[PDB]
Amino acid sequence: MRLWLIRHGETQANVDGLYSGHAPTPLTARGIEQAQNLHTLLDDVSFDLVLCSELERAQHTARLVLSDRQLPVHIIPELNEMFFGDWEMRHHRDLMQEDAENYSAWCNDWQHAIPTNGEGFQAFSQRVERFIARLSEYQHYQNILIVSHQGVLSLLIARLIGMPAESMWHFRVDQGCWSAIDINQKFATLRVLNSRAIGVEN
């Protein structure tokens, strides 16, 4: 099978440098342009399954990429952005002053520190691990499109090719781009990362 990875387009929180999390921040006109361009970039890619995160910025993207195509869309909560709790829709500068200790512990130990009343990277990375273990349930599909977020998709790449969760940061997943990873007998091959070219089915 091949997973076509798409991160949602630009959002207002991105423009304002804010932590996004589960908060419903809207797509910016640039993010609509990014998704609309992606629709034509992968128009001739014959998908048979779409898996999308619950957050509407991802579903808004999946609508624009899909357009009139009418493909089945599964809403997978495992594909959701990390839940930052009290820190959502707030900026890094303000957090170091309003919540100094809990936020410093996160900046100095992002892998184990829990965002204030949110979910830590351990629970987040276990969610993605469960999604990976669920891929056998889609074994009858050939071209699955995944619409998700930067942290989910980057960690998905890292875990699929057999690396620890920490090395997710070697694969930044960009907006307005698409990536693809092939899996055969649970051996993952990263084939395309952050392309803006017309897709070609493999």
Short mmCIF file of C-alpha atoms in Angstrom, two decimals:
data_model
loop_
_atom_site.label_atom_id
_atom_site.label_comp_id
_atom_site.label_asym_id
_atom_site.label_seq_id
_atom_site.Cartn_x
_atom_site.Cartn_y
_atom_site.Cartn_z
CA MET A 1 0.00 0.00 0.00
CA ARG A 2 0.92 3.68 -0.33
CA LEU A 3 0.03 6.41 2.16
CA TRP A 4 -0.34 9.84 0.59
CA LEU A 5 0.37 12.34 3.37
CA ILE A 6 -1.08 15.86 3.36
CA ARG A 7 -0.74 18.34 6.21
CA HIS A 8 -3.54 20.90 6.47
CA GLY A 9 -2.99 24.33 4.98
CA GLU A 10 -1.98 27.53 6.73
CA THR A 11 -4.17 28.65 9.63
CA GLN A 12 -4.59 31.89 11.56
CA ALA A 13 -2.80 30.41 14.58
CA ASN A 14 0.20 29.78 12.33
CA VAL A 15 0.09 33.39 11.15
CA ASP A 16 -0.04 34.49 14.80
CA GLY A 17 2.63 32.02 15.95
CA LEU A 18 0.23 30.41 18.41
CA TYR A 19 -0.02 26.88 19.73
CA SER A 20 -2.86 25.25 17.79
CA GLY A 21 -3.77 21.92 19.38
CA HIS A 22 -7.41 20.92 19.26
CA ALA A 23 -8.64 24.52 19.04
CA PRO A 24 -10.76 25.32 15.92
CA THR A 25 -8.52 27.81 14.23
CA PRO A 26 -9.65 28.62 10.67
CA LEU A 27 -7.77 28.15 7.43
CA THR A 28 -6.31 31.33 5.94
CA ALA A 29 -6.94 32.24 2.29
CA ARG A 30 -3.41 30.95 1.70
CA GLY A 31 -4.39 27.62 3.25
CA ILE A 32 -7.40 27.38 0.95
CA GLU A 33 -5.06 28.15 -1.97
CA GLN A 34 -2.66 25.45 -0.74
CA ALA A 35 -5.44 22.86 -0.56
CA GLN A 36 -7.00 23.87 -3.88
CA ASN A 37 -3.63 23.58 -5.62
CA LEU A 38 -3.17 20.16 -4.00
CA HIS A 39 -6.53 19.10 -5.45
CA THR A 40 -5.20 19.61 -8.97
CA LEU A 41 -1.76 18.26 -8.03
CA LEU A 42 -3.30 14.87 -7.13
CA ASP A 43 -6.35 14.90 -9.41
CA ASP A 44 -5.11 11.89 -11.40
CA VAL A 45 -4.12 9.89 -8.31
CA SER A 46 -6.80 7.21 -7.88
CA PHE A 47 -7.37 7.09 -4.14
CA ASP A 48 -9.58 4.40 -2.64
CA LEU A 49 -9.58 5.61 0.98
CA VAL A 50 -9.29 8.90 2.87
CA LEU A 51 -8.33 9.03 6.56
CA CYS A 52 -8.65 12.42 8.22
CA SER A 53 -8.22 13.94 11.65
CA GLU A 54 -11.25 15.16 13.58
CA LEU A 55 -10.08 18.79 13.65
CA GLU A 56 -11.96 20.89 11.13
CA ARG A 57 -8.85 22.51 9.64
CA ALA A 58 -7.92 19.02 8.42
CA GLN A 59 -11.45 18.26 7.21
CA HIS A 60 -11.67 21.65 5.49
CA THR A 61 -8.45 20.69 3.70
CA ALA A 62 -9.71 17.21 2.80
CA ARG A 63 -12.83 18.78 1.27
CA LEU A 64 -10.82 21.11 -0.97
CA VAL A 65 -8.36 18.44 -2.09
CA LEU A 66 -11.17 16.00 -2.76
CA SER A 67 -13.59 18.42 -4.45
CA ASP A 68 -16.24 16.55 -6.48
CA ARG A 69 -14.46 13.19 -6.19
CA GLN A 70 -16.86 11.50 -3.72
CA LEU A 71 -14.40 9.23 -1.89
CA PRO A 72 -15.05 7.57 1.49
CA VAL A 73 -13.66 9.64 4.38
CA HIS A 74 -12.84 8.03 7.72
CA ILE A 75 -12.45 10.41 10.67
CA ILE A 76 -9.65 8.92 12.79
CA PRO A 77 -9.21 10.56 16.24
CA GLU A 78 -5.69 9.09 16.40
CA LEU A 79 -4.77 11.48 13.57
CA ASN A 80 -5.68 14.49 15.73
CA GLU A 81 -3.18 17.16 16.70
CA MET A 82 -1.71 16.89 20.18
CA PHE A 83 -4.02 18.37 22.82
CA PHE A 84 -2.15 21.28 24.43
CA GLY A 85 -4.76 21.89 27.13
CA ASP A 86 -4.58 25.36 28.65
CA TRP A 87 -1.78 26.37 26.25
CA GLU A 88 -3.90 26.35 23.08
CA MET A 89 -4.38 29.61 21.15
CA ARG A 90 -1.53 31.14 23.16
CA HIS A 91 1.96 32.30 22.25
CA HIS A 92 5.38 31.09 23.36
CA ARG A 93 6.41 34.46 24.80
CA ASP A 94 3.27 34.85 26.91
CA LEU A 95 3.47 31.27 28.19
CA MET A 96 6.98 31.70 29.66
CA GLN A 97 5.57 34.50 31.84
CA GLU A 98 2.01 33.36 32.63
CA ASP A 99 2.90 29.68 33.23
CA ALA A 100 6.67 29.82 33.73
CA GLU A 101 7.43 26.58 35.58
CA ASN A 102 5.13 24.19 33.71
CA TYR A 103 6.08 25.75 30.37
CA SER A 104 9.83 25.77 31.10
CA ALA A 105 9.58 22.09 32.01
CA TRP A 106 8.02 21.54 28.59
CA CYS A 107 10.58 23.62 26.68
CA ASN A 108 13.40 21.76 28.46
CA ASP A 109 11.83 18.27 28.24
CA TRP A 110 9.24 18.19 25.45
CA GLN A 111 9.21 14.39 25.37
CA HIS A 112 7.96 13.88 28.91
CA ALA A 113 6.52 17.13 30.25
CA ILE A 114 2.73 17.46 30.09
CA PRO A 115 1.22 20.68 28.68
CA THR A 116 -0.91 22.27 31.39
CA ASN A 117 -4.15 20.25 31.52
CA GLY A 118 -3.32 18.71 28.14
CA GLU A 119 -1.77 15.50 26.79
CA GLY A 120 1.94 14.72 26.80
CA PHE A 121 4.09 13.45 23.97
CA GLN A 122 3.93 9.94 25.45
CA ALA A 123 0.15 9.72 25.07
CA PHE A 124 0.34 11.44 21.67
CA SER A 125 3.03 9.10 20.33
CA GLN A 126 1.08 6.10 21.64
CA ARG A 127 -1.98 7.30 19.73
CA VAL A 128 0.05 7.32 16.51
CA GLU A 129 1.45 3.89 17.38
CA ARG A 130 -2.11 2.56 17.66
CA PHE A 131 -2.91 4.06 14.26
CA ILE A 132 0.15 2.30 12.81
CA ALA A 133 -0.99 -1.00 14.33
CA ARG A 134 -4.40 -0.44 12.67
CA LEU A 135 -3.00 -0.26 9.13
CA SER A 136 -3.41 -4.02 8.66
CA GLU A 137 -7.15 -3.36 8.87
CA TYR A 138 -6.82 -1.36 5.62
CA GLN A 139 -4.78 -4.08 3.86
CA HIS A 140 -7.23 -4.19 0.92
CA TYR A 141 -6.59 -0.57 -0.13
CA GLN A 142 -3.83 0.64 -2.45
CA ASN A 143 -3.74 4.47 -2.29
CA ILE A 144 -4.82 5.83 1.10
CA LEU A 145 -4.75 9.61 1.50
CA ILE A 146 -4.04 10.86 5.03
CA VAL A 147 -4.99 14.43 5.97
CA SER A 148 -3.49 15.34 9.33
CA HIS A 149 -1.02 17.60 11.15
CA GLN A 150 2.71 18.26 11.31
CA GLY A 151 3.37 16.36 14.53
CA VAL A 152 1.26 13.35 13.53
CA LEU A 153 2.61 12.94 10.01
CA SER A 154 6.26 13.58 10.88
CA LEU A 155 6.07 11.03 13.70
CA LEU A 156 4.21 8.63 11.41
CA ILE A 157 7.11 8.73 8.95
CA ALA A 158 9.69 8.26 11.70
CA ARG A 159 7.98 5.29 13.36
CA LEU A 160 7.14 3.55 10.06
CA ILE A 161 10.78 3.41 8.94
CA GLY A 162 11.72 2.11 12.38
CA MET A 163 13.08 5.14 14.23
CA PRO A 164 12.35 6.31 17.78
CA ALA A 165 9.69 8.92 18.38
CA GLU A 166 12.32 11.58 19.10
CA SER A 167 13.67 11.56 15.53
CA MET A 168 10.31 12.74 14.12
CA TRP A 169 12.00 16.11 13.69
CA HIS A 170 14.19 14.89 10.83
CA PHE A 171 11.06 15.00 8.59
CA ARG A 172 9.30 18.35 8.74
CA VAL A 173 6.01 18.08 6.83
CA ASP A 174 5.20 21.28 4.95
CA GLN A 175 1.95 23.04 4.10
CA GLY A 176 0.87 23.17 0.48
CA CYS A 177 2.87 19.98 -0.16
CA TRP A 178 2.22 16.25 -0.28
CA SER A 179 4.27 13.21 0.71
CA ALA A 180 4.02 9.48 0.08
CA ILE A 181 5.31 6.42 1.90
CA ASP A 182 5.10 2.81 0.66
CA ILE A 183 4.57 -0.16 2.99
CA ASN A 184 4.98 -3.79 1.96
CA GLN A 185 5.14 -6.56 4.57
CA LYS A 186 5.38 -3.74 7.12
CA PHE A 187 8.61 -2.54 5.50
CA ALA A 188 8.16 1.19 4.94
CA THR A 189 9.86 3.09 2.12
CA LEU A 190 9.72 6.89 2.10
CA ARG A 191 9.33 7.83 -1.57
CA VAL A 192 8.23 11.49 -1.70
CA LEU A 193 8.51 14.27 0.88
CA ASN A 194 7.05 17.77 0.57
CA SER A 195 6.41 17.78 -3.16
CA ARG A 196 4.59 20.50 -5.09
CA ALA A 197 4.59 18.55 -8.37
CA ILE A 198 1.76 16.65 -10.02
CA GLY A 199 1.37 13.29 -8.33
CA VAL A 200 1.92 10.04 -10.22
CA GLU A 201 0.49 6.78 -8.91
CA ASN A 202 3.03 4.05 -8.17
#
